[PDB]
Amino acid sequence: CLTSCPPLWTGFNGKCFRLFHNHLNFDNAENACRQFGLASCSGDELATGHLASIHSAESQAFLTELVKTSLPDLITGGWAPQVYIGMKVGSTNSDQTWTDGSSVDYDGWVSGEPNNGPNSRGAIAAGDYSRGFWADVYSNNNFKYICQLPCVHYTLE
Amino acid sequence: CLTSCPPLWTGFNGKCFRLFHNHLNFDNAENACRQFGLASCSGDELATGHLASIHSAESQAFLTELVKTSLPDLITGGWAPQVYIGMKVGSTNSDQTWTDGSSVDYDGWVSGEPNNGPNSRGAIAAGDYSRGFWADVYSNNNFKYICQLPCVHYTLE
Amino acid sequence: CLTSCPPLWTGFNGKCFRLFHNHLNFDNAENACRQFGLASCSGDELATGHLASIHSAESQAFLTELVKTSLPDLITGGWAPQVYIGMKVGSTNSDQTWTDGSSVDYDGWVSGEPNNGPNSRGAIAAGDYSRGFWADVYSNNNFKYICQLPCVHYTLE
Amino acid sequence: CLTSCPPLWTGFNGKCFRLFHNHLNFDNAENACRQFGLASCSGDELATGHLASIHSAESQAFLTELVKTSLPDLITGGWAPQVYIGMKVGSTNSDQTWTDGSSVDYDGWVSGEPNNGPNSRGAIAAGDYSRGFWADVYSNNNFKYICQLPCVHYTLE
Ligand SMILES: OC[C@H]1O[C@H](OC[C@H]2O[C@H](O[C@]3(CO)O[C@H](CO)[C@@H](O)[C@@H]3O)[C@H](O)[C@@H](O)[C@@H]2O)[C@H](O)[C@@H](O)[C@H]1O
Ligand SMILES: OC[C@H]1O[C@H](OC[C@H]2O[C@H](O[C@]3(CO)O[C@H](CO)[C@@H](O)[C@@H]3O)[C@H](O)[C@@H](O)[C@@H]2O)[C@H](O)[C@@H](O)[C@H]1O
Ligand SMILES: OC[C@H]1O[C@H](OC[C@H]2O[C@H](O[C@]3(CO)O[C@H](CO)[C@@H](O)[C@@H]3O)[C@H](O)[C@@H](O)[C@@H]2O)[C@H](O)[C@@H](O)[C@H]1O
Ligand SMILES: OC[C@H]1O[C@H](OC[C@H]2O[C@H](O[C@]3(CO)O[C@H](CO)[C@@H](O)[C@@H]3O)[C@H](O)[C@@H](O)[C@@H]2O)[C@H](O)[C@@H](O)[C@H]1O
Ligand SMILES: [Ca+2]
Ligand SMILES: [Ca+2]
Ligand SMILES: [Ca+2]
Ligand SMILES: [Ca+2]
C-alpha cells in the first residue's frame, strides 16, 4: 500500500493531509477543515475533516517535513511559521483533546509547552527554535493550518 | 487509477465486492454482509456493508464476470447459478429498493422480471438463458450472495 | 492504505493476486500468468506477471484463505485441492527458486516435502492434511493456479 | 478510484507529482526528477522519473492550481513564478517533445509562445499575466520545477 488521496492532498500512514495558506483563527481553521466531508454513496454525510491530529514520532516528522518543505522561505530563527493542528488544551494541562476525537497518545510539545492554559490551542512551530514541535497559543491567533480528511478504515470482523 | 480494497475483496469503480459461497436466504445474506463495516480511526462505527447494489451496465458486467469466473462449473444453460444482490421488490413491481439505500437508477432485469412479487428479491442469474441479468425470486431461497463494503467518497467543498 | 488492484484481482501487502480455475500444467500456468503485465503509460512493456511467490507466514495465510474461500466445496481431508504457485525444486531439494526471480526467504513446505525431486513444482495443498502448506508435484499435473501481477515500488532515493 | 502516491507527492489522473522549491536550470531540474524511479520488488530497475508532462486542459488546470496554491505569495502581475515542466522546443517551434517521451497531444502555450528557440524549454508561468499557461525560456534559467513519478499501468490482455 501507498495511501490514496484526492488531488492536492498528500498521504501518510493511511491519512490524507493538506496545508492551507490562508490565516485563520483556531475555530475558523477547524471549521474550514470541516467543509471537507465523507459521504455514503447513497448521499448521507458520515464524517467531516478536522485539523490534523498526530499520533506518533513518525507522523510528527512527516507533518514537520510537510510544513518546512512547503514554506521554506518563511522558516525563521524563532517559532514562526506556526501552523494550527487539532490540539485543544482545556482547563488544566492534562485536559488535552484532538478535534477529531482521537486519543492524545503522542506528546509533541516543545519543552515548557503547553504554558498558556487554560483553553489554549496547539500549533506546529516550524521555525528553528522549535523544529516543528508544538507550541500552545491563544485561539485568536490567525495562522496557516493543516487539515486531515476523515480517517476511516474497514472493519472486517 | 484503481480501487483500493482489503484482502479477499475486489474493486470496481470505487466499490469493493466479495462473493460468498454459503447459501443463505435474503435477510440472512444481508445480515452476513452487515458484519463488515466502516469505522473512524477514532473508533466510531460509521457504516455497515450490504448486499451489492448495481448502478450501470459496466457495474452489471463486472459482477456478472465475478460470478461466472468464480463459479465456472456451476454455469447452466438456464438461470442457475443465482446469486443474491441487494434488490427488494415490494408490493408492486415499481417498488424497487436496494438495501444500501441507493437509487434504483439502473435496470438490469431479464425481460419479464420481476414476476414473483410481492416482496420478491433480486439475484444475478448467471446461467446462459439470463446471462447475468436479474431474476426475482422468493426470499426464502438459499443462494450464494455478493456483498459490498460501505460505499463512501470524499466531498471536497 | 490498502493495496490497489485491478477488478477481479485481490491485494495483500502491496501485491495483486488472482486464482484461476482452468486446470493447466506448470509451464502453461506460468505462461498464462505472463500474459498480464505492467507497461509505461506511453506504451513500453516493463514487466510480466508470474505464478505467485510467497515470502512470509502472513502471505502464506492470505493465499491459503484465498484458496479455501474460493474452493470451499473442494476441500478434502487429504491434500486436495492443490493450486500451483511459482515454486521450482531443482536437481536437489535445496535448489528452490521462484518464477518471478524473487528470493526463497520463506519456507512453507508441508513436513516431508519436497520429496518428488528432481525438477518438481510447488502447489498450495489446501486439503485438511496439509492446511494450505506446500506439496511438490510433477509439472505435468494440471491444477488451478494463482497469478500475481508485477510487484513494483517507487524508488525515492 | 483515487490516485495513490508516496508521502509529499500528490496525484491526478493516475500520476504522481511534486513541486520542488530549489531553483535549478532545465537540465539539473530534469536530473533531480530522474532521481525518483520504479523498481521491481526483486530489485530490478524498471523506470526513471522526469519533469512533468501535460496531456489535457484538466491536467493543465490541476498543475496550475498546484503551483498557485503552493506559491501564493510569489504570484506576480507578470509571468512569475515560472516553474519548469518537461517541455523541449527543438530546432523549430514544431519540434516539441516531453522528456518522458510521451505524446505532445496538448497545447498549453501562452499566445505567442514558443518564441525563444531553438532548444528553449517550457515552464508553467503562474503569474497573472499568463495564468499558468506556458512560456518558453532559455534553458540556463534557474526555476522551481514539478517532477512526476514514472507513469505505469497494468496490462490485462
Ligand atoms: O507561540 C510561540 C511561542 O510564543 C511565545 O514565545 C515568544 C518568544 O519566544 C522566544 O523567547 C524565548 C527564548 O528562549 O523563549 C521563551 C518563550 O516561551 C522565552 O521565555 C524566551 O525569552 C523567542 O526568542 C522570542 O523571539 C519570542 O518572542 C510563548 O511564550 C511560547 O510559549 C510559545 O507559545
Ligand atoms: O428464478 C429463476 C426463474 O424461475 C422461474 O422460471 C423458471 C423457468 O424459466 C425458463 O422458462 C421460460 C423460458 O422458456 O422463462 C420464463 C420464466 O418465467 C418462462 O415463462 C418461460 O417458460 C426455463 O426455460 C424453464 O425451464 C424454467 O422452469 C420464474 O418464472 C422466473 O421468473 C425466474 O425467477
Ligand atoms: O501432491 C500431494 C501429495 O501427493 C503424494 O501423496 C498423495 C497420496 O497421499 C496419501 O497417501 C499416503 C497415505 O498414508 O500419504 C503419503 C504421502 O506421501 C503416502 O506415502 C501414503 O501412501 C493418500 O492416501 C493417497 O491416496 C495419495 O495418492 C505425494 O507422495 C506427496 O508428497 C504430495 O506431493
Ligand atoms: O519567460 C517569460 C516571458 O519572457 C519574455 O517576456 C517578458 C515580457 O512579457 C510582457 O511583455 C509583452 C507584453 O505584451 O509580452 C511580450 C512577450 O514576448 C512582449 O513582446 C511584450 O512587451 C511583459 O509586459 C513584460 O514586462 C515582460 O518583460 C519573453 O518575451 C516571453 O516569450 C516569455 O518567455
Ligand atoms: Ca505557549
Ligand atoms: Ca422471477
Ligand atoms: Ca510431494
Ligand atoms: Ca518565450
What three-state secondary structure class fits C147?
A: strand
Chain D residues closer than 8 Å to B4 by CB: 2, 4
Identify the H or E element spanning B19. strand B15-24
DSSP assignment letter at D41: T
Degrees (nearest 5) of the Cα angle D9, D10, D15? 100
Question: Is the CB of B1 less than 8 angstroms away from the CB of C4?
Answer: yes
Binding residues of A for Ca(2+): 113, 115-116, 136
Q: What structural domains does chain B harbor?
A: 1-157 (3.10.100.10)
Burial (0-12, 13-18, 19+ Cβ within 10 Å), A75: middle
Chain A residues closer than 8 Å to C2 by CB: 1, 154
C-alpha cell at A10: 498528500
Peptide bond into B150 cis (omega under 30): no
Q: Give the closest residue to D13 by CA, choosing from A7, A12, B11.
A: A7
Chain A residues closer than 8 Å to D12 by CB: 7
CA C7 to ligand 7 center in whole angstroms: 34
Distance CA D24, CA A121 (A): 39
Chain D residues closer than 8 Å to C153 by CB: 38-39, 41
Distance CA D123, CA C86 (A): 48
- Ligand 3 atom nearest C130 alpha carbon: 2
Q: Is the CB of D135 under 6 A from ligand 4?
A: yes
Question: Is the CB of C8 less than 8 angstroms away from the CB of B72?
Answer: no
Q: Is the CB of B137 under 6 A from ligand 2?
A: yes
Amino acid residing at B130: S
C-alpha cell at C74: 473442494
What three-state secondary structure class fits B123?
A: strand
Which subunits sit against C, judged by 3+ Cβ pairs under 8 A? A, B, D
Distance CA D10, CA B70 (A): 36
How far is CA D130 from its chain centroid? 16
Distance CA D24, CA D69 (A): 21
Q: Give the closest residue to A130 by CA, choosing from A108, A97, A104.
A: A108
What three-state secondary structure class fits A63?
A: helix
Given CB atoms, is C78 within the 8 Å cutoff of chain A? no
Task: Say how many C-beta atoms besides its own lie within 10 A of residue C90's C-beta.
Answer: 14
Grid cell 504522481 is found at: D16
Grid cell 503569474 is found at: D127
Given CB atoms, is B3 within the 8 Å cutoff of chain D? yes
Q: Give the closest residue to D104 by CA, choosing from D65, D134, D140.
A: D134
Distance CA C121, CA C98 (A): 10
Distance CA A16, CA D8 (A): 10
Degrees (nearest 5) of the Cα angle D36, D41, D45? 45
DSSP assignment letter at C66: H
Distance CA D123, CA D82 (A): 6
How far is CA B52 from its chain centroid? 3
Under 8 Å between Cβ of A4 and C1: yes
Given CB atoms, is B8 within the 8 Å cutoff of chain D? no
CA B99 to ligand 5 center in whole angstroms: 52
Under 8 Å between Cβ of C135 and C125: yes
C-alpha cell at C127: 486439503
- DSSP assignment of C84-118 equals EEEEEE-SSTT-EEETT--------BPTT---S-S
CA D83 to ligand 4 center in whole angstroms: 16
Q: CA-CA-CA-CA torsion for B1, B4, B9, B12, nearest 10 degrees? A: -30
Q: Is the CB of A134 under 6 A from ligand 1?
A: no
Question: Is the CB of C45 less than 8 angstroms away from the CB of D4?
Answer: no
CB within 8 Å of D89: residues ≥ 6 apart: D95, D96, D114, D117, D118, D119, D120, D121, D122, D136
Q: Is the CB of C137 under 6 A from ligand 3?
A: yes
CA B44 to ligand 7 center in whole angstroms: 49
Q: Is the CB of D137 under 6 A from ligand 4?
A: yes
| HSE-up of residue B29 (Cα within 13 Å, Cβ side) | 31
Given CB atoms, is D35 within the 8 Å cutoff of chain C? yes
Phi-psi map region of C120: left, alpha, beta (phi>0 left; psi -120 to 50 alpha): beta
Distance CA A113, CA D44 (A): 48
How far is CA B101 from its chain centroid? 13
- CA-atom Rg of chain D in angstroms: 15
Q: Give the closest residue to C60 by CA, choosing from C153, C116, C125, C115.
A: C125
